[PDB]
């Protein structure tokens, strides 16, 4: 165990056989600084206030994904193709701030103990899939090497609207819904 | 369910007391098993599991690999601290303190940063401890935290309850009141 005032992940490198596919992000004290959109080859800073201006060439991540891709194939042989174990994710729903009907807020759906890093997180309003007004963090890292993801939903609390968070994962026998209402 | 295989490479920088003590660590992980690692405190690569022995012995032989790993504390950690972390560590977001019943009273302290926080309960200026229950710190994921701290209580007509909050972004504590309905 390492004791320190602060800890940064200037290199959370993920690559998995399913896809195949990977992810590159930097973290500071547990929060996401940025991620590199691997398809568009662009650096995506999540919050321009946590983007203490210093540029990051997207190329540094593609390069690192190559090594990861190569390294995965090597380790698969070295580990006699031992498959990954689907963990059972735990979902929890809560509001950003206190709820005052007729006031703009945000519901947060935390999906913890995720593994492997493949999951579907969508919202439901009275049973209907809430297409937009949604957002998501990348797969954030955990010291036990599993991941956690956080989904957001901006909304106006009312008496005629209930909500749910739908999470689909191989570690679940069926879609799991977490309920929430004013 | 489709079978899967996962690889993880984590580049970590640990900081203590500004930048006086810096420590860098890289971890290679297959699925959920860290098999090899380089810890600047140790100085060379180390197998963490049997499958990492070959890797460590080979990389420790290569003069470039080893020297590069040792130069990481400066080329990456100390470098990034100057370029971005020092600045991020200046981020301050004051907490929002609100009280509301649910006989429980809830001090909902929300939207703050950094994590350091002190929350006390008071009934007529005397601190309440027995009867107080607090959740752990909650990470919103958007660079802000929140924390709920409940108080078991039985209301009387003249009592004044106060939620007292201190945070590094506050020149003076915030105090929100609540009086018997």
């Amino acid at each position, epitope marked *: 165990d390492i004791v320190a005032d602060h800890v940064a992940s200037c290199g959370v490198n993920l690559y998995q056989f399913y896809g195949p596919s990977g992810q590159y992000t930097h973290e500071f004290d547990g929060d996401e600084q940025f991620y590199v959109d691997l398809e568009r080859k662009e650096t995506a800073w999540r919050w321009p206030e946590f983007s203490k201006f210093g540029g*990051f*060439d997207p190329q*540094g991540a593609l*390069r690192n*994904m*190559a090594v990861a891709k*190569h390294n995965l*194939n090597i380790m698969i042989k070295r580990y006699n193709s031992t498959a990954a174990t689907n963990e059972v994710p735990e979902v929890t729903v809560f509001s950003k701030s206190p709820v005052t009907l007729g006031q703009p807020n945000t519901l947060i759906c935390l999906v913890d103990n995720i593994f492997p890093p493949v999951v579907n997180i969508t919202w439901l309003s009275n049973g209907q899939s809430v297409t937009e007004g949604v957002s998501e963090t990348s797969f954030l890292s955990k010291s036990d090497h599993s991941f956690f993801k956080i989904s957001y939903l901006t909304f106006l609390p009312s008496a005629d609207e209930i909500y749910d968070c739908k999470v689909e994962h191989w570690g679940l026998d069926q879609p799991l819904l977490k309920h929430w209402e004013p | 369910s489709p079978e899967d295989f996962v690889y993880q490479f984590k580049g970590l920088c640990y900081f203590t007391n500004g930048t006086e003590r810096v420590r860098g660590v890289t971890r290679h992980i297959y699925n959920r098993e860290e098999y090899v690692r380089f810890d600047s405190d140790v100085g060379v690569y180390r197998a963490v599991t049997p499958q990492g022995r070959p890797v460590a012995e080979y990389w420790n032989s290569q003069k470039e*690999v080893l020297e*590069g790993a040792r130069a990481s504390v400066d080329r990456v950690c100390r470098h990034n601290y100057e370029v971005a972390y020092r600045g991020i560590l200046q981020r301050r977001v004051e907490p929002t303190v609100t009280i509301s019943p649910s006989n429980l009273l809830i001090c909902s302290v929300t939207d703050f940063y950094p994590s350091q926080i002190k929350v006390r309960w008071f009934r007529n200026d005397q601190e309440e401890t027995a009867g107080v229950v607090s959740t752990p710190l909650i990470r919103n994921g958007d660079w802000t935290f929140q924390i709920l701290v409940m108080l078991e209580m039985t209301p009387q007509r003249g009592d004044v309850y106060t939620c007292h909050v201190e945070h590094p972004s506050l020149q003076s504590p915030i105090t929100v009141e609540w009086r018997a309905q």
Partner: T-cell receptor
Framework: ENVEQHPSTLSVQEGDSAVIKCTYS??????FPWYKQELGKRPQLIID?????GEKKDQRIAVTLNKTAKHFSLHITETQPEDSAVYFC???????????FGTGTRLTIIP | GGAGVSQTPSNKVTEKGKYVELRCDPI?????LYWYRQSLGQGPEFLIY????????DSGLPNDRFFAVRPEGSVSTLKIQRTERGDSAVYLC??????????FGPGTRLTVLE
């Protein structure tokens, strides 16, 4: 991006000195190697310099760097016939390890 | 590989439309391998960059008729299909222990005739 190299051709008397100047565009550049190439042969790495030093000498060869101005030069002193060849400067960045070369300079040392 | 990066043969002459393959045996140990193209009068220009078995950067590939491989993070092969007169140039190969300091091979001059 762009590495500008001058002069395109150079003729110098055996014994005299030769200088090749280059200007790069990306300030992110941190590695500046130099290559010597002989007819029908590949480029050979002869010397390099990183953004953390302004000068570096190695025998008859010398290279300089000015990060602020984005100029880096090559110095061959006391040139000898074997120095006749085409030279190239190049630039690399911490994040992009691919090299972007200059147009080259055909150096001819008159015996 | 050996002490230096090898590229044989030094010359390959063919005509428009044929299929051509160029091989590169890297310096033993080097994990990074590049391919560069050189039209004479000019300096080398980037084509593709390999880290181990996979491509880390293939932005330099002129068009879809070019494709390279390094099935074992060792010897690499640049394949060109339905060759065109405009593909004539010297194809240089370079390897690096980690990626930055690059060492070139003798190169292979590809001459495509009508």
């Amino acid at each position: 991006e762009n590495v500008e190299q001058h002069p395109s051709t150079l003729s110098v008397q055996e014994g005299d000195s030769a200088v090749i100047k280059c200007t790069y565009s990306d300030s992110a550049s941190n590695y500046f190697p130099w290559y010597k190439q002989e007819l029908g042969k590949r480029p050979q790495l002869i010397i390099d310099i990183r953004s953390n030093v302004g000068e570096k000498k190695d025998q008859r060869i010398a290279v300089t760097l000015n990060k602020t101005a984005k100029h880096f030069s090559l110095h061959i002193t006391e040139t000898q016939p074997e120095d006749s060849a085409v030279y190239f400067c190049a630039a690399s960045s911490f994040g992009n390890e691919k090299l972007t070369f200059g147009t080259g300079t055909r150096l001819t040392i008159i015996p | 590989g050996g002490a230096g990066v090898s590229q044989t043969p030094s010359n390959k002459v063919t005509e428009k439309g044929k299929y051509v393959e160029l091989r590169c045996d890297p310096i033993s140990g080097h994990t990074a391998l590049y391919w560069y193209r050189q039209s004479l009068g000019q300096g080398p220009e980037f084509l593709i960059y390999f880290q181990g078995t996979g491509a880390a950067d293939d932005s330099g590939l002129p068009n879809d008729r070019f494709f390279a491989v390094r099935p074992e993070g060792s010897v690499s092969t640049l394949k060109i299909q339905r060759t065109e007169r405009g593909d004539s140039a010297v194809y240089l190969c370079a390897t690096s222990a980690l990626g930055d300091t690059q060492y070139f091979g003798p190169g292979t001059r590809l001459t495509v005739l009508e």
